[PDB]
């Protein structure tokens, strides 16, 4: 059949990274959307087609037909709202931040398990085109024993981050979470991490820069990096193995396209530019050098929902696991355990 | 009966190239009869096996109630005369370039079609060239913001090709300008005034083989249609500049070349652009970040002109080429010869 | 022997396009520099080396040792200061605008001739690397009969020019002057001109855009263009002839290097990036197609001064002739005689 879901929040986030992908997926049915201040203007198209709007949370929470809820309200509300949806017996999707403490994250996963429902952080970046190309190469084996993966998210916005505040407001908490998440889901939990978190423009300002390494033994390392003053781009992904390398330039364009007004069903949406296809350079068993492009997999944030669907409807393992989510939060937090630059050994 | 029954007045080169190959593979467009004083029974045989009937009467075509659409591919000088007969006979008409011999006549045809309750349009297949559809897609997606300029070319490196003097109808502006401006007019509308630079840059007294024409829209935007017969290194096929970025596109639609080479519309990758030729957009988002992208060139298919006609006749879709677009095009075209080049012309209104 | 010179103005333009080049040349000796408000800091490096500074103009004009003066003072004051210098028996170099009125320019050229001195507007851009490459290709003949040249100077500066003012402060007077001067120096006086001058952002503001055509008969035209909203650049030069084309991307970096603090004596100064080397695609007598690159000649604004040295030390003919100067002023002014776009026919000369 289909999955009936509801939305807690009808703001920017829900209208850009969620509804567009979901309103096009028939396996998913947006029955109710909640918001204390629903923008009727934008609500109009949705009201037609059949979705119901309300400022009554209880109305959404106690809807016996709704089985999934996505939380898009501002950060501080997530933990409390997630608990209410779990209490009401509905599976839950939480946009970052998942919670503000590792303890609370643990509890959200417990309550979910104790109520027989799925609870997961929204990790749409697991479906960026470039990441998918990188993941595909690593899984296919071409490069052999992988010794290093470098992943970036840079900008040329000098002077954009000058504000002073808590760690929750810097780039590591805003961007680092996405980069590490998809690398963790691929390579697992690292044994140690090194941090270089700071602001290369205004020392005392919240961090707008980070260079974090995830160490797996002595052979493999994954580097997540962000710099707000990069005019000429680094590859989006760099992979080096015993048999070869994989270098991919160009970032997934879903976000930019969405900000420009292009919807998920427009011609060529999520498709990468041939000039940005990653290139593999490796040697086979015979010792010959093979050099080809990897057609970037189609970028599609909607696949996150397709995954939730499979989990709720056909028992498929959930996309984001408790271990991945927690490992991620631990790393994130340890980043401020000691003065940067620091080194941190993962629990257990 | 779900299809649109049509006929053809003329079985010459253009019909066998830009029309029939596309319509004979479309279930919705049923070609019932083809008129022509000299058919060539050999070139016709393959069509008769598919159902189309041939005749040299013309009155047989304009006479039966089954035919509701006629495309005129006959020589230029016969277009007005024939379009009028078809319209008066109660049929919608598609006329190849040129629509008419004069503006007054063009207005008459549109007026007649209107009082007979039928659709009348000039054939504008180049509104479906791949490069054009890419440029059009970019303008519609708004990456470039406020557009200030568009340059569109149809150039060749054929020195010594145009050398004979002749009437305006025989030159490059009349042969290619119409196409270039028509698709641009479809996007931006009727301009305020036009600038003309029309001549032959090899033999002065000969028919024009070169043109650089600017369509002005206010003080902000202008579209430049241009043609030169002595260009070794090609200009981009399209140049679009706006407040937020640019779109440059090299390479031309290959439908024509493929057709000439014997490749039919149903052939593998027909109309598909070469990746090395994908247009490139360079713009900056609201954040101020610069973005460089390639635009997967939309498939070129002149057959969509007939798909649009089908939707207009069978269903109620708006016609592709409007009366305003067609009349604005003929006017600018004729005005270009009103005064000796270089000159400036203010559109009526 | 050297040419003893003086400067009327110690502003930024004098410290950018003049002194850096002249201070590294033995043939040119900078004696005195005048400015109503010279800042000692920027002057210190000059004090030693032997150059004297004065706040009294007459101290420079009455110096019998000086034979050449360069006017770098603000526009409005060019005619008057140029006249005084000439009346003092000095040859002068005037930065744009040469004069405020045509009659005045004619007067200076007359005074100069009367009292045996050289009078010329400063046109350093006749030495931009790209222009010299285009110029070389023209002289060598590869292209055959030249049918068209397009030359640009664009920026991506949306919302930059927003104030209205005299035509004198617009882009055509500011940039067009340089673009046309070097084209006139090569192709001569055109018979008619085409004008498209406006501000593509705020119609009422001073012009920030121009597309101007110089017509040479019916075969050749030179297009000079400026647009402040161009994200993906046009070629710096485009040349098409009966035998081939020449496309040159990439602008001369002297201005940028100077702007960045690099002096003319720095490693590779004036040298072009191999990736920006212009390309010629032409056909030889045998019909063979030859694709070659043209090593961009070294850009060097100081060559304007070497040219001045040769003319007044030896007998060399001056770089900028009065004909070239007056023709330029004419085209410049005729661009505002009628509302744009318009057409103008140069006076029979």
PDB file of C-alpha atoms in Angstrom, chain B residues 148-149 151 157 159 193-197 199-204 210 212 214 216 218-222 224 226 228 230-236 239 241-248 250 280 282-284 290 341-344, chain C residues 147-148 150 156 158 192 194-196 198-203 209 211 213 215 217-221 223 225 227 229-235 238 240-247 249 279-283 289 340-343:
ATOM      1  CA  UNK B 148      20.618  42.083 -21.000  1.00  0.00           C
ATOM      2  CA  UNK B 149      21.784  40.428 -24.220  1.00  0.00           C
ATOM      3  CA  UNK B 151      23.478  36.773 -29.629  1.00  0.00           C
ATOM      4  CA  UNK B 157      32.716  29.409 -44.132  1.00  0.00           C
ATOM      5  CA  UNK B 159      33.519  32.366 -49.411  1.00  0.00           C
ATOM      6  CA  UNK B 193      12.967  49.041 -32.607  1.00  0.00           C
ATOM      7  CA  UNK B 194      15.397  47.169 -34.800  1.00  0.00           C
ATOM      8  CA  UNK B 195      18.841  47.995 -36.113  1.00  0.00           C
ATOM      9  CA  UNK B 196      19.984  46.675 -39.472  1.00  0.00           C
ATOM     10  CA  UNK B 197      23.357  45.925 -41.022  1.00  0.00           C
ATOM     11  CA  UNK B 199      24.722  43.571 -47.151  1.00  0.00           C
ATOM     12  CA  UNK B 200      27.035  41.318 -49.145  1.00  0.00           C
ATOM     13  CA  UNK B 201      30.586  41.544 -47.831  1.00  0.00           C
ATOM     14  CA  UNK B 202      32.168  40.003 -50.947  1.00  0.00           C
ATOM     15  CA  UNK B 203      30.303  41.571 -53.874  1.00  0.00           C
ATOM     16  CA  UNK B 204      28.563  44.824 -52.943  1.00  0.00           C
ATOM     17  CA  UNK B 210      25.538  38.992 -44.330  1.00  0.00           C
ATOM     18  CA  UNK B 212      23.940  41.834 -37.989  1.00  0.00           C
ATOM     19  CA  UNK B 214      19.643  44.021 -33.218  1.00  0.00           C
ATOM     20  CA  UNK B 216      15.887  46.360 -28.905  1.00  0.00           C
ATOM     21  CA  UNK B 218      13.761  49.058 -23.790  1.00  0.00           C
ATOM     22  CA  UNK B 219      17.221  50.185 -22.688  1.00  0.00           C
ATOM     23  CA  UNK B 220      18.002  46.965 -20.841  1.00  0.00           C
ATOM     24  CA  UNK B 221      17.878  44.195 -23.418  1.00  0.00           C
ATOM     25  CA  UNK B 222      18.717  43.545 -27.046  1.00  0.00           C
ATOM     26  CA  UNK B 224      21.362  40.033 -31.897  1.00  0.00           C
ATOM     27  CA  UNK B 226      23.683  37.404 -37.083  1.00  0.00           C
ATOM     28  CA  UNK B 228      28.274  35.784 -42.161  1.00  0.00           C
ATOM     29  CA  UNK B 230      33.149  33.907 -44.260  1.00  0.00           C
ATOM     30  CA  UNK B 231      33.683  32.567 -40.726  1.00  0.00           C
ATOM     31  CA  UNK B 232      36.387  29.916 -40.197  1.00  0.00           C
ATOM     32  CA  UNK B 233      36.337  29.838 -36.388  1.00  0.00           C
ATOM     33  CA  UNK B 234      32.687  29.722 -35.242  1.00  0.00           C
ATOM     34  CA  UNK B 235      31.134  32.049 -32.723  1.00  0.00           C
ATOM     35  CA  UNK B 236      29.050  30.396 -30.045  1.00  0.00           C
ATOM     36  CA  UNK B 239      25.472  33.906 -26.051  1.00  0.00           C
ATOM     37  CA  UNK B 241      24.331  37.507 -20.527  1.00  0.00           C
ATOM     38  CA  UNK B 242      22.365  38.579 -17.485  1.00  0.00           C
ATOM     39  CA  UNK B 243      22.882  40.258 -14.127  1.00  0.00           C
ATOM     40  CA  UNK B 244      23.511  36.908 -12.423  1.00  0.00           C
ATOM     41  CA  UNK B 245      25.562  35.075 -15.016  1.00  0.00           C
ATOM     42  CA  UNK B 246      26.072  33.837 -18.551  1.00  0.00           C
ATOM     43  CA  UNK B 247      25.277  30.921 -20.847  1.00  0.00           C
ATOM     44  CA  UNK B 248      27.593  30.099 -23.764  1.00  0.00           C
ATOM     45  CA  UNK B 250      28.801  25.976 -29.116  1.00  0.00           C
ATOM     46  CA  UNK B 280      27.723  26.041 -20.069  1.00  0.00           C
ATOM     47  CA  UNK B 282      28.172  30.486 -15.123  1.00  0.00           C
ATOM     48  CA  UNK B 283      26.095  32.252 -12.514  1.00  0.00           C
ATOM     49  CA  UNK B 284      26.059  33.068  -8.832  1.00  0.00           C
ATOM     50  CA  UNK B 290      29.791  31.045  -8.392  1.00  0.00           C
ATOM     51  CA  UNK B 341      21.666  49.705 -44.673  1.00  0.00           C
ATOM     52  CA  UNK B 342      22.803  50.632 -42.042  1.00  0.00           C
ATOM     53  CA  UNK B 343      19.456  51.841 -40.692  1.00  0.00           C
ATOM     54  CA  UNK B 344      17.173  52.070 -37.660  1.00  0.00           C
TER      55      UNK B 344
ATOM     56  CA  UNK C 147      35.654  41.252 -43.409  1.00  0.00           C
ATOM     57  CA  UNK C 148      35.218  41.865 -39.678  1.00  0.00           C
ATOM     58  CA  UNK C 150      35.225  42.590 -32.969  1.00  0.00           C
ATOM     59  CA  UNK C 156      31.126  41.659 -14.516  1.00  0.00           C
ATOM     60  CA  UNK C 158      26.301  44.633 -11.942  1.00  0.00           C
ATOM     61  CA  UNK C 192      30.097  55.630 -41.498  1.00  0.00           C
ATOM     62  CA  UNK C 194      26.734  52.725 -36.075  1.00  0.00           C
ATOM     63  CA  UNK C 195      25.883  53.532 -32.427  1.00  0.00           C
ATOM     64  CA  UNK C 196      24.270  51.577 -29.588  1.00  0.00           C
ATOM     65  CA  UNK C 198      22.989  53.290 -23.238  1.00  0.00           C
ATOM     66  CA  UNK C 199      23.081  52.114 -19.644  1.00  0.00           C
ATOM     67  CA  UNK C 200      21.585  48.614 -19.564  1.00  0.00           C
ATOM     68  CA  UNK C 201      20.651  48.919 -15.891  1.00  0.00           C
ATOM     69  CA  UNK C 202      19.395  52.454 -15.216  1.00  0.00           C
ATOM     70  CA  UNK C 203      18.420  54.048 -18.571  1.00  0.00           C
ATOM     71  CA  UNK C 209      27.337  49.929 -22.460  1.00  0.00           C
ATOM     72  CA  UNK C 211      28.101  48.365 -29.337  1.00  0.00           C
ATOM     73  CA  UNK C 213      30.335  49.705 -35.652  1.00  0.00           C
ATOM     74  CA  UNK C 215      32.129  50.767 -41.495  1.00  0.00           C
ATOM     75  CA  UNK C 217      33.005  50.203 -47.414  1.00  0.00           C
ATOM     76  CA  UNK C 218      30.688  47.227 -47.779  1.00  0.00           C
ATOM     77  CA  UNK C 219      33.241  44.519 -46.990  1.00  0.00           C
ATOM     78  CA  UNK C 220      34.631  45.436 -43.591  1.00  0.00           C
ATOM     79  CA  UNK C 221      33.420  46.721 -40.245  1.00  0.00           C
ATOM     80  CA  UNK C 223      32.944  46.434 -33.778  1.00  0.00           C
ATOM     81  CA  UNK C 225      31.921  46.778 -27.425  1.00  0.00           C
ATOM     82  CA  UNK C 227      29.184  45.635 -21.213  1.00  0.00           C
ATOM     83  CA  UNK C 229      27.399  42.612 -16.893  1.00  0.00           C
ATOM     84  CA  UNK C 230      29.376  39.841 -18.599  1.00  0.00           C
ATOM     85  CA  UNK C 231      30.203  36.772 -16.485  1.00  0.00           C
ATOM     86  CA  UNK C 232      31.575  34.528 -19.245  1.00  0.00           C
ATOM     87  CA  UNK C 233      33.964  36.694 -21.359  1.00  0.00           C
ATOM     88  CA  UNK C 234      33.960  37.205 -25.100  1.00  0.00           C
ATOM     89  CA  UNK C 235      37.233  36.821 -26.994  1.00  0.00           C
ATOM     90  CA  UNK C 238      37.825  38.343 -33.160  1.00  0.00           C
ATOM     91  CA  UNK C 240      37.453  37.037 -39.776  1.00  0.00           C
ATOM     92  CA  UNK C 241      38.794  37.227 -43.301  1.00  0.00           C
ATOM     93  CA  UNK C 242      38.355  35.459 -46.630  1.00  0.00           C
ATOM     94  CA  UNK C 243      41.047  32.920 -45.697  1.00  0.00           C
ATOM     95  CA  UNK C 244      40.496  32.266 -42.019  1.00  0.00           C
ATOM     96  CA  UNK C 245      39.922  33.536 -38.521  1.00  0.00           C
ATOM     97  CA  UNK C 246      41.834  34.724 -35.498  1.00  0.00           C
ATOM     98  CA  UNK C 247      40.375  34.309 -32.010  1.00  0.00           C
ATOM     99  CA  UNK C 249      40.934  35.175 -25.423  1.00  0.00           C
ATOM    100  CA  UNK C 279      44.672  31.005 -32.498  1.00  0.00           C
ATOM    101  CA  UNK C 280      44.629  31.348 -36.254  1.00  0.00           C
ATOM    102  CA  UNK C 281      42.637  28.933 -38.363  1.00  0.00           C
ATOM    103  CA  UNK C 282      43.347  29.619 -42.017  1.00  0.00           C
ATOM    104  CA  UNK C 283      43.628  28.010 -45.417  1.00  0.00           C
ATOM    105  CA  UNK C 289      43.730  24.037 -43.221  1.00  0.00           C
ATOM    106  CA  UNK C 340      20.685  55.965 -29.720  1.00  0.00           C
ATOM    107  CA  UNK C 341      20.637  53.746 -31.667  1.00  0.00           C
ATOM    108  CA  UNK C 342      21.614  55.841 -34.706  1.00  0.00           C
ATOM    109  CA  UNK C 343      23.821  56.045 -37.817  1.00  0.00           C
TER     110      UNK C 343
END
